Nucleic acid binder design. Structure first.
Ligand SMILES: [Mg+2]
Ligand SMILES: [Mg+2]
Ligand SMILES: [Mg+2]
Ligand SMILES: [Mg+2]
Ligand SMILES: [Mg+2]
Ligand SMILES: [Mg+2]
Ligand SMILES: [Mg+2]
Ligand SMILES: [Mg+2]
Ligand SMILES: [Mg+2]
Lengths: 68, 292, 169, 159
RNA sequence: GGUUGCGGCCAUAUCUACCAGAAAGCACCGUUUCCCGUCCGAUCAACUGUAGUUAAGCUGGUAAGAGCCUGACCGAGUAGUGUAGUGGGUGACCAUACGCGAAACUCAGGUGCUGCAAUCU
RNA sequence: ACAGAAAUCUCCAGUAGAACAAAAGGGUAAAAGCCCCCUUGAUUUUGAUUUUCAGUGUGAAUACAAACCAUGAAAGUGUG
RNA sequence: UCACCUUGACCUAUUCUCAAACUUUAAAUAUGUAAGAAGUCCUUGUUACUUAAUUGAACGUGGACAUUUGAAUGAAGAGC
């Protein structure tokens, strides 16, 4: 589907299999260890992540499967 | 509400003493900035601040590291001059203004020259230079954040130190006695305020109105029976005592500064360290999310 | 709680917004003069829209501000008119309140050239002791969160002395 | 047509240095300028009087005249094939001392001081500054620090 | 060490929430004849520290706080750039050689310092 | 209350998101803005300086100096 | 409906992509000045300027220091 889309473009284009998980900025095993752990939770289009920063009450309000 | 992260990042704070409401820097610059061909010549100003239950009066020049106090006076040392009450009236402002003049001139050695106006009349008089002597000690009035109003006590020390022998440049039109109708000072009315006339007449009409308010107000005065008319001789008993001895007696210091410190170092809260702030957050996880 | 943590009146303000100026609004000043006992201040117009009939800077309203023991003898002159019945509205979230009545003016007779009616807008500003820190010049601070007036502490004060009841008809 | 006014092209130069707008802090008015002092010209945009022309921003010159709020500063300006002496009347809030000349004058006091114990003994104390000379001999030990690095890494796209 | 006045640098000091303050100072606070100012002694002025209070101001602490500040071989020797070649490539651009070298991000740490005067169980 | 989406009144938040005659850029928060009071420095005299530059002229501007005034309690500020 | 699968914007936390006449930051190259005898230090002479005050200011008398005298390289003569 992307190889046919090359013909519509001038120049030269590559089909790079990314090592990230989907549309994220972290790799497939890095996304996994964040997934059994509780730093991953759904949004509309994307996923929100947990930090060691900010108020502890907001780290409890959102993301409550963590701290177990 | 909602002072956002983008709001706080872009906020420029006022200095510290604009943020404390304690300094007009618009006025401070114009008071302090010396003519550049008068290179290191210190430009002196008379700080006259009025708090509740005190008058604070200072002689100050400026350095880059901070301001420098040459001579300071307070109205809370007027007890030893014979003024035990009325320490924030119009006339203790004269009394502190007279003292800071005479304390500075003996400090600088110019006390025998420039005695000022000796017997006080409330004539608008300015300290004239002694011919072929040193010029008088030029000091400008800093009223600070207080308002220029006709009859204000901040202009009490202005008459206090002008007659005390300091060259303080002024007009007279903020003394009690100016008229918007006739552009002329009233020296007879102003003669009263220096010697506590505006306080003394209030007793004599509270003598004739009610003893109720005369028992609330002047309750100290009832206890040690200073006469309602005897104020003018109280102030003259202090105006003589100032020129006799303005030399700044210090006080006792009464459980001194090394043990004043440990007396006030046991009620101040201690800022923590990382090793317990981590321990508190490590506690707070088991406290907030320890599965109830 | 504290002898300086008690809800007080600061100022009662008495508003009439006449839709014009001229001979009419002198009488709107005189009716608000005698209620207060103080000389009242007029207010101009902020702009002109050609749909409300008021033109910018023509002094189209009056008000007066009363403080202290005089102000507490004007509230009940409009509260029995309001029948001691305030609503779910009438209250700011900051802790003040007001209402709008008409024609008490049979009380307080002058010569009374009775040509016209002047309805009038009650509003009172509450405070607590220590409100000086925001209005004083030197060290102009801000009142803390605890000591600041709230919408509850004035509806807990109106259902106190002046003995009324709220939200109902 | 073309525009060649006084503050032309001064959009960013006379600007007020983010989160430092407002009043001029008072150390600027307490600084003392004598004739012969070497000063850096940096215009404060919040003061529009006594303000240098855009040519002199960042230029460094010598105080020659002192008036009430202003120093007279001499700047050399290249005009054609020579330099011309430019005399500028700038108020002291566009002006700071050049910190290099404080660094020079201490070295003058230092070289006077270092030559004093050159007069107690051991003449020609070698007080001139020298550049970064080449390094000397070393003997690099290996105890706990055995030499190890591998090879160049292969090509990965790591998207 | 506290506090006050005058400051210097002007957030490590700002902002948000909660909690403490012994003394002292500061503050709120009492009154309106006078000087003075107002629609109104709330502001301002004047008076006595007298009726009272730390409730606020104010100081300090707490916050895996927001912000701000410092450092990092953290990104990253990266992007960019100076210089060189009868280098590559059809070109777009790219690689090398001799140099200079970030920022955003990320972790770690911090949250006013200090001058002059005066006073404080 | 009329009175609403926009009349006036009152509080909270408000770093400027407004305003400063006129374009745009810069600057400004106990002000340079808004309100009030007083005034004519938008004055006289001669030099110096900056920009355009031949370091000519013209225009504009900056700092002084001798005066004379304004102003304010004063430090100061004002030669549009 | 006379509190509802079929709400628009608005607010809060995310997300992809950008700016010659946007910006917290911020290079490389280019650019100003300094690296001393017309200097530094000590003493104190003058003045009508300046200071509360010979205090400062400016210029000095007299004295102290000599080419590693205050980075590197060059200089082909320098200046007019
Ligand atoms: Mg002022
Ligand atoms: Mg242009
Ligand atoms: Mg009062
Ligand atoms: Mg070539
Ligand atoms: Mg304009
Ligand atoms: Mg514009
Ligand atoms: Mg022109
Ligand atoms: Mg371009
Ligand atoms: Mg360039």
């Amino acid at each position: 589907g992307l190889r046919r889309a090359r013909y519509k473009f001038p120049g030269q284009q590559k089909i790079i299999l990314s090592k990230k998980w989907g549309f994220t900025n972290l790799d497939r095993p890095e996304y996994l260890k964040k997934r059994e752990a509780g730093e991953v939770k759904d949004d509309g289009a994307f996923v929100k992540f947990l930090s060691k920063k900010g108020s502890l009450e907001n780290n409890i309000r959102e993301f409550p499967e963590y701290f177990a | 509400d909602a002072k956002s992260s983008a709001y706080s990042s872009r906020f420029q704070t006022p200095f510290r003493r604009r943020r404390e409401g304690k300094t007009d820097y618009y006025q401070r610059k114009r008071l302090v900035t010396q003519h550049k061909a008068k290179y290191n010549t210190p430009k002196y100003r008379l700080v006259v601040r009025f708090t509740n239950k005190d008058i604070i009066c200072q002689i100050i020049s400026s350095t880059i590291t901070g301001d420098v106090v040459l001579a300071a006076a307070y109205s809370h040392e007027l007890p030893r001059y014979g003024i035990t009450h009325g320490l924030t009236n119009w006339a203790a402002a004269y009394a502190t203004g007279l003292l800071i003049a005479r304390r500075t001139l003996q400090k600088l050695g110019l006390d025998e020259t420039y005695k000022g106006v000796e017997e006080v009349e409330g004539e608008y008089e300015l300290t004239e230079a002694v011919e072929d002597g040193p010029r008088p000690f030029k000091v400008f009035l800093d009223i600070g954040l207080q308002r220029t109003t006709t009859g204000a006590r901040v202009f009490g020390a202005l008459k206090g130190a002008s007659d005390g022998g300091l060259y303080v440049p002024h007009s007279e039109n903020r003394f009690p006695g100016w008229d918007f109708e006739t552009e002329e000072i009233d020296p007879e009315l102003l003669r009263s305020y220096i010697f506590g006339g505006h306080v003394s007449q209030y007793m004599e009409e509270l003598a004739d109105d009610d003893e109720e308010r005369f028992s609330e107000l002047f309750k100290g005065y009832l206890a040690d029976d200073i006469d309602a008319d005897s104020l003018e001789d109280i102030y003259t008993s202090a105006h003589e005592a100032i020129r006799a001895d303005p030399a700044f007696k210090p006080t006792e210091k009464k459980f001194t500064k090394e043990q004043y410190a440990a007396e006030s170092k046991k009620y101040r809260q201690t800022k923590l360290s990382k090793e317990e702030r981590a321990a508190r957050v490590a506690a707070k996880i088991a406290a907030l999310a320890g599965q109830q | 709680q504290n002898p300086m943590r008690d809800l007080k009146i600061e100022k009662l303000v008495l508003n009439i917004s006449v839709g014009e100026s001229g001979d009419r609004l002198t009488r709107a000043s005189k009716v608000l003069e005698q209620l207060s006992g103080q000389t009242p201040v007029q207010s101009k117009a902020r702009y002109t829209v050609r749909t409300f009939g008021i033109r910018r800077n023509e002094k189209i309203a009056v008000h007066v501000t009363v403080r202290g023991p005089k102000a507490e003898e004007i509230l009940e002159r409009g509260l029995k008119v309001k029948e001691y019945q305030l609503r779910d509205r009438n209250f700011s979230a900051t802790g003040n309140f007001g209402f709008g009545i008409d024609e008490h003016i049979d009380l307080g007779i002058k010569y009374d050239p009775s040509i016209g009616i002047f309805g009038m807008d009650f509003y009172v500003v509450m405070n607590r002791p220590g409100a000086r820190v925001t209005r004083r010049k030197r060290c102009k601070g801000t009142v803390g969160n605890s000591h600041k007036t709230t919408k509850e502490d004035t509806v807990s004060w109106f259902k106190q002395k002046y003995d009324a009841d709220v939200l109902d008809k | 047509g073309k525009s060649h006014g006084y503050r032309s092209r001064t959009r960013y130069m006379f600007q007020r240095d983010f989160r430092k707008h407002g009043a001029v802090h008072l150390s600027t008015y307490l600084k003392v300028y004598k004739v012969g002092d070497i000063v850096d010209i940096k215009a404060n945009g919040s003061i529009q009087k006594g303000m240098p022309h855009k040519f002199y921003q960042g230029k460094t010159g010598v105080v020659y005249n002192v008036t009430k709020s202003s120093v007279g500063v001499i700047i050399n300006k290249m005009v054609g094939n020579r330099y011309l002496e430019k005399r500028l009347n700038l108020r002291v809030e566009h002006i700071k001392h050049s910190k290099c000349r404080q660094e020079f004058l201490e070295r003058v006091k230092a070289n006077a001081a270092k030559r004093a114990e050159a007069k107690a003994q051991g003449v020609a104390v070698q007080l001139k500054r020298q550049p970064a000379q080449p390094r000397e001999s070393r003997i690099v030990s290996t105890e706990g620090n055995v030499p190890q690095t591998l090879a160049p890494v292969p090509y990965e796209t790591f998207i």
